[model samples]
Target chain A: QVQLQESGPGLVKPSETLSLTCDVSGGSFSGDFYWSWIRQPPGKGLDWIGNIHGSSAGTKYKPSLKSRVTISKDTSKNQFSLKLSSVTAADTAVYYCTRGPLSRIVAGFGRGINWFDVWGPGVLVTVSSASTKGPSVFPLAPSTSESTAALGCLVKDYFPEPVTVSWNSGSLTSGVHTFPAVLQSSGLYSLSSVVTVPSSSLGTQTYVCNVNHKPSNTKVDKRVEIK
Target chain B: QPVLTQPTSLSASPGASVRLSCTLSSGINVGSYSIFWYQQKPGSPPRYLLFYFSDSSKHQGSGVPSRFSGSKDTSANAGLLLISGLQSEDEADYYCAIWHSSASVLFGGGTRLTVLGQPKAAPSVTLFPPSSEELQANKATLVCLISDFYPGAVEVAWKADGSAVNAGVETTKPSKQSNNKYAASSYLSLTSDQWKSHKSYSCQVTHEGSTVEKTVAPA
Candidate 1:
């Protein structure tokens, strides 16, 4: 019964950093465990922020929050803390600290993808910039270029950059062009990509656009329904 | 992480007792780790029952009821949850958890415990805190996790210095689960000096026509 307890502030101003700590009890935080932090927006599902090793305070984080979040430990006291910078209302959520069991010899757990066994009650943090955390997107808007005469999808007003755009049709097709993610002046992003298809594929087959942005925690599938 | 295996279902009558099993992963020995159990009644969230090592005594977590007990068999690499004087309220999904010696947390798929012929069981309740801490050198907060109970609207109250304390308190609506059960939480914030000076802080729960209370005193 190694208990984990998280303590931190309930509200933080926008653009400021959020910091909190978790105290380990009834057991030592010495080895084989990944001290991790997980969070959930008021009504949304859970998100895995990342984890750290106990002895060295070394960290591993999700690509989106990697630049802004830092997880470190003060082993002398058996507690670890989380710091997230440039936060806005988007960072508002209940932050829970947990222990993910990791073993050198076992591959069953698969590297902290979501194995939270010991948990601490979470603490809530609120930021002011929350409304700007998301980007607006249009559905199934397509265009064609004379150079390639190929199909393309256009995205607009997407934020938090690093969006993953993918294409899918009736079956599965490759050689599809992707823009990875493009940054917007308002801190958002836009993408445009082209794909080659069979001549009759236009109206008969529907094209789908999927954009996955880790920072915004958004996954969108845009498709034109053809009857 | 070790894999735990458990039977899907078990049936018994009121007053009869049954022992549930949580077999450990093949690579480990049962005696090497601590075993814990949780009870999730149909339509309710899981509630911790007990945390015991293979050779531990009946000393369980604060606020835990006595009907549940645990044991370990090193030879078979299995952890067991034994229920005595079984009643309608005892029917639940029993899950076994282990904090392996190697630091992995493993859980069994869960065994559905059924009280034979008892369809409408009375609600079972529990009130416990997640490992709490002394807050802000002077202020502190703890979460009272109320779970494994049925019929959603349970009453919750907190106390400080033996008197009712309500500031900085938040209660969640009982959310229903897949089995049509419910679970909720109550969070209380206070000053460490308040509990330390008076030495009394408690959580009271009123459910199923009864009340259960647990206190956290300065240590």
Candidate 2:
């Protein structure tokens, strides 16, 4: 049977990127299997980072992570890696590396998103701003025009650190912005930020959530528009 | 967690009778824990023979004997099942299963058995570190090394000879192959132990209903 393992730093500085790698053995890397990265927050549920295929070397990311996540594979080393930028304290968890097919099959021995059934042991990485890591800017929401009305963005915080949230309308807004939490039955946590901009501010208007943490500085900027 | 419990042991004379039991891991709202039974014969893969959920038991294939039966106990967080006229072939290890909220399946540590009469040679066991020997050094790594088996949840224990090693462990769904067979693998790992003499450690995979043990020594 194919075996998999993951390796990475156990800790990361706030606002910096968290990177990890999974090494494959006992089988060829260029096959039907899709290499994947999954993380379980300290006391929470599993989160999918994304996956990569060996043959085409194609990559896919979780929709929410499209902006800041990148997964790549190294054929010579039989290993794959994950990079999540602008991290806060919430990113801490045991990250797993697994292999399976690209899709979920009902009749086949293994089918459908069957990717990564065999998981590697997970490594815990704690993120803190107190460290001396360089500052990194996090991407927030996108710019909008008068034709658009609603805006949204995702924020990730590593561990042992607090993330600062602010809106920028060409200028920084004061006070911390608290996003609402959306909890799933399986106990996963997700946050969504929504802001209603005046019609006059729609065109050429931009709102950004800047998370300032020590060891690294990151911001997620979004553009507002009118529908 | 579901609140179901099973007996530590159940036995019956060959060609006689035996009953296996399992209790829910936690309180159940609808039916007894979806109890399933798997039969792992000697030197072979495990087969998902039957499952009991919502007061019904469905057999997976035609080869399963009608003598094997399952039932639920509403008053108790347990499900009881019987295997009548047990044959020598029924001497393999058995396990109980419950579905997780995530739709992933969880299996209980399997039960070992002492078959009556006849001695069979033990199987060979092999255990390898999850990764190959050629990787770069000085980084954190999590290796999930597994042993393949035909029957039962393979007995997996991490040991440095006399002492037990601590690591996370979990079992996967019984994967059935197209060749009319089933196989399963366990997840276990150790970190930062590379280059240590602990490389001589072994993961013991017991098969044949725990009658035979195949150990995979660290490579």
Candidate 3:
């Protein structure tokens, strides 16, 4: 009978960090378990922030929020915490804490079936701001060698870096790499990813780089082709 | 067919080995992707069992028993979760998942693994009619309590005058009782007029392939 609760402030000023704690009862941290934070804006969908395994022993975050989200546990207090920095109105949402089992094996690159079984009653946090910005995607010129080609997409000027940036093309699922979102001097964020595929495929296929910014409800698609 | 398909139920005895299958859609190949397996017990969250990419390459969850392993049936386009030396405690639900594409991941309907050689017990169902206070408030609430069940795999449904009731019905997940048995509750809400319109309401509990219905008529 594991119980969880979220304790945090109801309001956060823009550009300051938003910190929340999740208190756990009837659970232990001696094993491989994760305390995760998830959020949903009023009338919007859920955004998985990430989770911390053990007492800050290991962490896995969404790629876009990897740079700004920090999830850690405090074994002494039997609790975990979430910190999201450089916030805007887009970051306002009802946050929830959940308990799940982290992946035990490294058999593959990603984590296992991470399901939130028990969740805390959510607490709404309103980021006191009025502005929001969506990402703009720019597709770089393709670079090809004798056998393979590298396609790049640069996503810039997105506030509240909870965005999904990925590549879509024929038979291109693996070999796509995305970098962490870099916070800019203007308080916005930028991200980039590259997809490597066979040069022969590039000549016959079209690659589309997509960016979905949830807060702004904006999607940008950059298409690339090589003759 | 769905992107991922699994059997609704499977049975195996203790000390035996059973293979649970998660078959992929015909258009997808099982060899290209890794499969993840999860184990979920009553009143608990799903636990990561292991992820299998190949026989030579796989990883099991931390502290997971070595008896749990994974393999694939390329002929059937399916990934398999094999549990060797199964025990009674292993009786639970098993789910298989895969990264169908970069933008999406797919999960199969869970397979309920029932360990044989153990005695099965049916649930005791009790129907409690709406309280006088609730009726005075112009609404009625029916309570169906199920208890003393084994294995904790049970379901509850509500019926009013023989028709199934869907809306305003809620059922709690089965919880282990202090006596090592399981108990759960289902509630049905209705307006006073609707309650009077029906002669009786039924609380149907399904367990161990059998259903027991307790009916209560308005007093």
Candidate 4:
């Protein structure tokens, strides 16, 4: 019989990363097998993060969290790990690792569903964030048309939900559109704002996007020059 | 539309052909989509066997033997798995699956195939007390050896002083012997104090719906 044991930190901070490792006993990792990481939120149903195959056989992730989730293994140690970046309160859950059958050949194009047979006792991770991480701001290249040029500012990975994005310190409000905060797979939030200016003066003037993260008490500015 | 139905079990002779059925729901047609099959054995994970849609569109899994083939029964609106010249090792659980409209794979309830005509044989059960090596380490291991059985599937249980024991019991899967028979071993682990407290322990081996039990008294 095969046995599995999960080990990791019990607590994580918001906007930080969460990592966990699973150690295997009585079995060796093989190409015909898949290692899976599953989680369940408090009082909620089970959620499948993804699984990794043996020695570069393959890896798969849940499409919703594909951007933030990574499942990797260590052949020498006979273990696998799960890394989830930029976590928030919503990411708190009990994570479990398991072994399942991989029906298809490791490097083949066709694959089938995996049913886990052996599982480890789960480890609970609480996302406790009294201090949040500030957002990272980037300025996109201006898009020029006949009459106007739109300057874009991208803000990503901010915690505590509410953030303010302004152009030229809130003075350049005309033709400015800020999209809604998108909740990312990492549990943080992101948004992009665009400000339009006259194409004739696009090179002469400087456009700045100021991102204020109130929870983290930090502000970042991204300046764009069309020239 | 994506539901699949399969019989609970099927029986056939070892040398004959057996067609396992996987019927689709009324709204879906069996002819349009490809059907995949998987084989599962006791204490092992499922193994992909083959897939088929039409004669021109089919693939047998890597290392899969030619005896296993997939086809469809258009009249019954079902998929078929045809095993030619079946052998004793072919007896296993078979499942048919298809990609559903919901963008996920839907599997049938699986069918257990039993190969007939094998000579019936019962396992010889033997019980052994804990070894001095393990007892010196403050632990006791009771071993039960079961050998010489046909149709490898069997269930093993343990009892302490006439009551069923649940914990610290591990049984290995039946392994084929060189003589074409099957053998398995069951271990019952206990603390040295617990083993000494019990007057006798029992190991029960169940095969072909009948059970044979053997008991051991501590030395």
Who wins the TM-score comparison? 4
Model 4: per-residue Cα lDDT over B17-114, one tens digit each:
98999999988899877787877664334556887878877777668889899899999999999999999888778887775544344667788888
Q: What is the lDDT of residue B139 in candidate 2?
A: 20
With candidate 2 superimposed using the best TM-score fit, by how many Å does residue B54's alpha carbon deviate from the native? 16
Better of 2 and 4 by TM-score: 4
| Docking quality band of candidate 3, CAPRI definitions | incorrect
How well is each residue in A185-216 modelled by candidate 1, as lDDT tens digits?
34444544445566567657777766565555
Per-candidate TM equals 0.35, 0.33, 0.43, 0.45
What lDDT score belongs to each candidate, Candidate 1 first?
Answer: 0.62, 0.52, 0.72, 0.74
Residue B128 Cα positional deviation in candidate 1, in Å, after optimal superposition: 40
DockQ of each: 0.01, 0.01, 0.01, 0.01
Which candidate wins on lDDT?
4
Shift in Å, residue B130, candidate 3: 6.9
The sequence of per-residue lDDT tens digits that candidate 4 reaches over residues A1-227 is 67888887766788888999999878787666678887766444345688887646587776668899988888889888999999998898878887764554323424433445466777768787644668766554553155765566656557754577898888888767555555544556555566667886685777889887665778888786543
Task: Please give, as one word, the docking class of candidate 2.
Answer: incorrect
- Residue range B1-219, candidate 2, lDDT tens digits: 443355655556677777676666554532724566655544333445666554333433347788887766666656656788777667666766554443333444455443454343333332223332212333211222222334424555555653566754443344333322344443343343542445455445555656332233333
**Prediction RMSDs, each to the true structure:** 26.6, 25.0, 25.4, 27.8
Interface RMSD over true interface Cα atoms for each candidate: 22.1, 21.8, 25.9, 26.5
Residue A186, candidate 1: Cα error in Å is 30
Model 2: per-residue Cα lDDT over A1-227, one tens digit each: 67777777766877889999888888878876577776766434345677787676887666667898999888889888999999887777778776754333223332223223456767767775444332222222223234433343333223223344456633643222233222223222223333445545545656665444432444444442222
Candidate numbers, best lDDT first, in rank order? 4, 3, 1, 2
